[PDB]
Amino acid sequence: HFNVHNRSYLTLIEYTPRQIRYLLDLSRDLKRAKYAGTETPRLNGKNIALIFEKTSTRTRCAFEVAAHDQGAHVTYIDPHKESMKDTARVLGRMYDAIEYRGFGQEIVEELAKYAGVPVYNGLTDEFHPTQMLADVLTMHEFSDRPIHDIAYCYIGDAHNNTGNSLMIVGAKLGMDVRLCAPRCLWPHDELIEQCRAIAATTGARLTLTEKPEEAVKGVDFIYTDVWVSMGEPFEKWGARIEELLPYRVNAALLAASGNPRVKFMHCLPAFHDSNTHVGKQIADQYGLPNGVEVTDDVFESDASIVFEQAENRLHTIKAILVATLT
Amino acid sequence: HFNVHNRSYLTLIEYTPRQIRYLLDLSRDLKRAKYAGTETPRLNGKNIALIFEKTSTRTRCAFEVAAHDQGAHVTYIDGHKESMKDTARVLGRMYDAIEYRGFGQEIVEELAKYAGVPVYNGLTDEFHPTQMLADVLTMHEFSDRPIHDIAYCYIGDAHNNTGNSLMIVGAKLGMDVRLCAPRCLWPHDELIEQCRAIAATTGARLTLTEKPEEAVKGVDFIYTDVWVSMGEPFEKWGARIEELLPYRVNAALLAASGNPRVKFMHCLPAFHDSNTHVGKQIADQYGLPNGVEVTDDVFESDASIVFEQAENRLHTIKAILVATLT
Amino acid sequence: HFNVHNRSYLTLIEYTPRQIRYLLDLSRDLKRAKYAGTETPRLNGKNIALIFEKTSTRTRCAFEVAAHDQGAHVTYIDPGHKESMKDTARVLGRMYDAIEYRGFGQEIVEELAKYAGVPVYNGLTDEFHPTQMLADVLTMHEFSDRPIHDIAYCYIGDAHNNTGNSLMIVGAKLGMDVRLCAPRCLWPHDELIEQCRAIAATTGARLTLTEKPEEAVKGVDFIYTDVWVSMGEPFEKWGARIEELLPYRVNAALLAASGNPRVKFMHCLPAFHDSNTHVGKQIADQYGLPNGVEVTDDVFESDASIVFEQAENRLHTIKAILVATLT
Amino acid sequence: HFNVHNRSYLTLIEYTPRQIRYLLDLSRDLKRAKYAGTETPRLNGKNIALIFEKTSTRTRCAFEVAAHDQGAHVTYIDPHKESMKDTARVLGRMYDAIEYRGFGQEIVEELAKYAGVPVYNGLTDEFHPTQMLADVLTMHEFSDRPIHDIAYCYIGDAHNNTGNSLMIVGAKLGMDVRLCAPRCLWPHDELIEQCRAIAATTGARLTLTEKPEEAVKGVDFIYTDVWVSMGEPFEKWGARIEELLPYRVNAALLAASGNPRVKFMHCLPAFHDSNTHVGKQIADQYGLPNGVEVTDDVFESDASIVFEQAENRLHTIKAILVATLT
Amino acid sequence: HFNVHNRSYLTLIEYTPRQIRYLLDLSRDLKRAKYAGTETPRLNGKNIALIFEKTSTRTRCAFEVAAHDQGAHVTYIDGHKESMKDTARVLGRMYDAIEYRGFGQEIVEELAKYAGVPVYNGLTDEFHPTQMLADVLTMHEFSDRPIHDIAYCYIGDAHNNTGNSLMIVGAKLGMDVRLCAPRCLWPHDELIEQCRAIAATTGARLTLTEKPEEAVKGVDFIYTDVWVSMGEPFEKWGARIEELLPYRVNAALLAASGNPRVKFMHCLPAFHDSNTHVGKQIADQYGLPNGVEVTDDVFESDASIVFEQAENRLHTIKAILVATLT
Amino acid sequence: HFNVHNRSYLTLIEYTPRQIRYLLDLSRDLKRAKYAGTETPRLNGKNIALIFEKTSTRTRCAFEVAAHDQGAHVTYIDPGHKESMKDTARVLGRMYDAIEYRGFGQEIVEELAKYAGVPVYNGLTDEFHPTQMLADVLTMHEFSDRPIHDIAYCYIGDAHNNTGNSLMIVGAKLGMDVRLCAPRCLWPHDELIEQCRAIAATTGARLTLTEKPEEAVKGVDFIYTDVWVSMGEPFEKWGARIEELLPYRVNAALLAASGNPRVKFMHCLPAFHDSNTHVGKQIADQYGLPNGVEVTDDVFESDASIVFEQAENRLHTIKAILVATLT
Ligand SMILES: [Cl-]
Ligand SMILES: [Cl-]
Ligand SMILES: [Cl-]
Ligand SMILES: [Cl-]
Ligand SMILES: [Cl-]
Ligand SMILES: [Cl-]
Ligand SMILES: [Cl-]
Ligand SMILES: [Cl-]
């Protein structure tokens, strides 16, 4: 099944459609067991080491609950007196797996040669293949349609990791993907052509446009994300709000889909109000009190499934832990 | 039984006498099982998220052991970028409970409306209804008398949270409470009159006096706390010392009760010697080598039960976790 | 059997040979069970409080896995500002089954051990602790496959640090053939040498102290070294120590000088064997040591290196202490 | 809790009031489990060696049932070719505890230094702290009152081990103790003053009188024992009956208490009839057919609780075995 | 079923035929489980006190194995100082049953009124209803015929307890009983007439004769016992030998039955050779080298079932313990 | 494997080296399980009858704990007056799973073994039984930490009692270096010496018999002694035996004469090493031996004494026999 040697530190473009479907089915079964009270711990006695230099909460917390539900412990190693090559080989003889948050694909790949145990690259991080597994699992649950018939549109800053990953996964699974943003914020052309080649073999419909009205007509799901990602200078906001104001998700855009059942999605955190210190500061400076990338009315509406989407990250992380540690 | 909608974040004055007795009986049974080796984990598989802006050792440690004894796990989480209302709802779909240390009743009440799971306001914090449950359990164990016949005196700074809470619980349970302090350090009149109304329904005797010889006459327990509470300016020490020297707990005060079985209590930490660096600073400056609010002689005497009192906080936290998560 | 009252905070030189052998057998059995999948949790439901003033990774991680494998939980307490350590120990002793104190010193821990009411450890999670010596001896026994009192090893380098002192002590107690090789000014203190000579006379141990690497390693089964300077020792000390200890580097020629094709290399780690550390690169560039400082990268990565099996065995010896003292 | 190193061979005067209360609570919980059918064996696989030179039945049988109920085996070693120091060290490597019956406190204390396992001094013997735990447990059960409010009178030969032990335990626990006997048969004055010092700190009321009518007024329990203890010459009976006839327990004495609920107690065996070979011989010689230290009418009355008292020795012995072997 | 108040100390003649059949079926089932490895302990945790004035090996050993097989423990206890009525009531509150070996029916009946737990009269003793249950079970196993069609002859001293009991049980179960002995050694007339009345209700054939050739004609089993029973004066041997030589069991007597399948029985011990020091004394003095009451040739022959007969005493004791303690 | 029909009543000299090694491995594994808490009862539900004419404490207690640890029960039968032992054995063999005969002799037990129908032991609870030799060899292996056939030991004292005979036999069977040191009139019978020399030739054992203590102990790992007289031997024999055996006392000088700082002392117990026995005090006062008779109190209580570990191992070897013969 999911039998590749580098399966634990695979990047998203490397997943075959068969492997993705296998992990999605695994996530469905694990989620059913937890809801039904009949979960079977197959990681009893396992120990997982977690090494980081910068931290996360929403996705590091999903990881903890996934591990404990399956009977594993997590040990936190905090952030330079020993080479990472040496430390990985010491930890690989006491622990059953090592998670690296904040190091990048290249370092993790080298350490995988020497650890002797499965090594993950950011399983607890916001950018990881399991987030896309979680989003597609959410889309299948709410649409009740075959995955290759599902249509969705990502709108906003489409060249960040959320835009690139949504384009990739939709192409891999033969879905109807639309990315809507200013041309200067589209994914890199090299990546676009890579996903066009993928789409030809899977039947995927891939559209990139600057027109929100065209991008959302017929979609089951509308997906957005903060216009400035964590780390970029604040000074970038003023420019980005100028580019991306026409690309806000508001009630009118959902109606432009023509679909009464359309749902809204967001990988979170989201500036949908001024109850955040950063969000309020933007609300005062640029006159956006009702939300930046999505209005509070849409965020709190029954069309919003952001918190079901967040929950499904628990089950897909759990699926990776089961797939790679048993 | 404990079957109210707001049971997890109930404030002390909102508890009914029946609810308190139920949780005291629950704590006594759970303590019996732990001592006898027959404890049954009722919270296997549960995960509790712990969100905090401050930290403590004695009560955070009691919480951890209570959780593990019942089979639960604890995850520590450290607004800024995500609204607390957003964070609560994300955690509410992965975790079975959320503990908020150091946020205040109003915030926690609002977050309880949205989390979808039990929410506690400082269950791991020094100031919480479980501390009064532990103190009353300690009093009942050592006196061996019906709770409403027990007499005790709190002496010192009586308008801090220890003094307010001891007055409230004693009135709730029909006990004989004496608060002894200078008038300027008495509880607020609104709270006293609230407790007088409670005392009329329950038969409690509530006394507020400035004369220590009068306050301890006939008590089974004498209870004190640090004169300047953590958080208040250091400079309060100079004035409050002058006020509170006549209210020090020493051997003479215990004898003034006339009860050979009188016991001393203290919620801790206590400046009873110079082996704490704040306490030695107070000892050098104000000439208090024997201790500040209680003498080392009393603190170490066989009449001192401060450490049985500390232990019982574990069992009362456990009772709340069991009562609210099963 | 390990049934003394101060067994949890016992010092290395206070251990008897019978107690050391008992804990080594316990470590072997626990390691066998973990490998075979038949480990039996004897500490289910236990809670261990860990109070620390400094932190580590290799040994704190060994401790966590040891405790979890046996079913116990660990709670961390971090900075004695407002509560005296005596008060805190007595609060914790009524909720927890053991308290581990890292970074406080033997005398403080002994006094707290009186009042806590539960087993108390002095640096069970610290690099300097008797279980490190138990781990090293266990590693030597596994690889040499000969009785412990016939095993020969040489520690070479800064022989008056904790590694050198403890290796001389443990070798004398177990009747082994110990050599310490270092400049005369870096030998263990003369009173400790005389103590270990007295121990060696009763056990049959052969104890040698020499300034000559070629003689120190002749016939040894193991060559053992450590970093020449502690991060805790002042940074000035790094310059003079390196000048003294350059002739005591471990390299392929020193292993050849043993005359033993089966000789193994040991190091309690971390090791400055390349420039993938910021400090290791700075030592290498300033003092012209690109191939490694106290051991060459060639020896450290060779098949004769057993440093990572040596590191693993600390997990099993810590686990032995937890079982011996909490059951 | 019960954490002293010499806890297994402690003599009665060494017990702290906290330790006594802990063992009484342990006895209550163990007795409840046995009655309820929910007893948990925590001594499974333990082996206990029993070394004696003179034997007992009522208390050696309580010991056997206590050990088997908790999963332990008992091996009998019978009564000089090996030094007791050598034998103790051989047995301490095969067995988990050693019980010594008939050797005395001094020998047992020395052997405890070398056995390497808990050593008991007469846990199966009539004179042992657990008999006093059993008697106080009986008193609390039938009175349904706090132990320090309980009143009882021992009458008869008050300088034997029963009189000395009842005086000690009552002083330790703050009870109302009366000993009634001829002055020449009072406890040794040195012991009386020791228990007067104890009573001052615990609130105990300690009375020694020659007047039965004064000693029993207001008592919940009346306690007596055979006038001549096992071993003393028969010739001593003739003198003792002369001294102690006014101190017999008969129906009139129970009425002199003024308490309709008063109960009668006796550590047994008792000469309450002539169905014993020794008892009949006294009945013929000294004209006491209806009982010697207590009338048969009182012994068989509903006021008698001698057999509940005997049963409780099982549970207190069980409490010591649990407290010292786990 | 076995549901009478006096079931534990019932005498043989007090058993009803239904009760006997129930205990025989219980013994057959328990024996089947022990042989098949499927025995279920029904007496886990039970404690049986054993009070005795005499001792035996064969039947005390059968009792011990029956008790352990079912999970029970046995404690041996060795008046003088305590009345038996007092001792019984003390033991009745710690033990689940009491066995009295060697005291007589009347004493045990009185003690049953007070012990509060089942009391047996010599369940571990050679003379007990379970011995007849074992003998009848042996007869049924080997004959493979309905019990009331079985024929057997007891020969020898027929007014000892073996002869009395075989006459009683055979009448109770409708069997064909022949007692063969000199008239002066016949059972008492009162007992014979008691058994004749029983035989009329059950269809039993009861014969009493002096001619061995007549007594064994057509029997399936020939049964004998020692001519002088343990306890009787040695001097009875001289007279009783003279009386009982014509009644020796030898090969000729077995052939006189005319049944090739005839089996020999003996409750044991038996003087069948000179390897018992009493038996050799009788052999030397009276010229009986071949054996006394049975020849060594018959005892060791394949027609001898004395050892299957001995084993079945284990299973019948077990049936009584199960029937009376569950 | 221990699969002979007379395995339960096998005599020491009838054991093969393979069977001895098998039972020693079984003893090691059972001891490891008991220490680690992972002992598996293989004799649950068994009943063992114990018929005895004499009684003991050390070995009867080892037997009870061995049987209980494995789940079996023991029933005691005490005085062949009215029932022949053949009859009794056949009654018991149909209710019990094994019968242990103490104090009856090999020939009687062998004949009863034919008829009982269950395993029968000859003195499994007795001081003289092969499991005592298994226990002693196990003790020597644990403390020397070297292969059994390289182990050297000297038995010194009355070498023609059961201890001396059995130690010579077991050493020859296992290829060890045995020395017996005693007066010539107290050596084992010459026919047994020749038997053990024949055994020693096939196994490589080194067997020495000498009257010189200083030569007997040179190079030994263990010095082993026993009481000079049996309580069963007539009391007259005590006077002459002491005169003969005074030069063969074990004291600190004899251990020094071995030249081995690691030498250990062994004694099957009880030992007259002080006057805390009535008989030991009487020997000491009459013959002027206040410091001990066959061993000084100084040696008996020293760290070189292993008599109490030696005593414990009898529990594990008896347990090995019960498992090997009843499963
Ligand atoms: Cl594919
Ligand atoms: Cl209420
Ligand atoms: Cl040692
Ligand atoms: Cl080099
Ligand atoms: Cl106290
Ligand atoms: Cl009927
Ligand atoms: Cl062989
Ligand atoms: Cl000497």
Protein model, in words:
The structure is cut from a larger assembly and holds 6 copies of chain A. With 326 residues, chain A is of the alpha/beta class. Chain A is 45% helix and 13% strand. Chain A is built from 13 helices and 9 strands. Chain A has helices at 17-36, 58-69, 84-91, 105-115, 129-143, 161-172, 189-202, 212-216, 236-244, 251-256, 277-286, 296-299, 306-325; strands at 47-52, 73-77, 97-101, 119-121, 151-155, 176-180, 205-209, 221-224, 263-266. In chain A, the strands form 2 sheets. A 5-stranded parallel sheet of chain A has the order 7-6-5-8-9. The first copy, chain A, has a 4-stranded parallel sheet with strand order 2-1-3-4, sandwiched between helices. In chain A, helix 6 (161-172) links the parallel strand 5 and strand 6. In chain A, helix 1 (17-36) packs across helix 5 (129-143), helix 1 (17-36) crosses helix 13 (306-325) and helix 3 packs across helix 4 (105-115). The radius of gyration of chain A is 20 Å and the shape is globular. The two termini of chain A are 12 Å apart. The interface between A and B is medium-sized, with 25 and 22 residues. One chloride ion is lined by residues 16-18 of chain A.
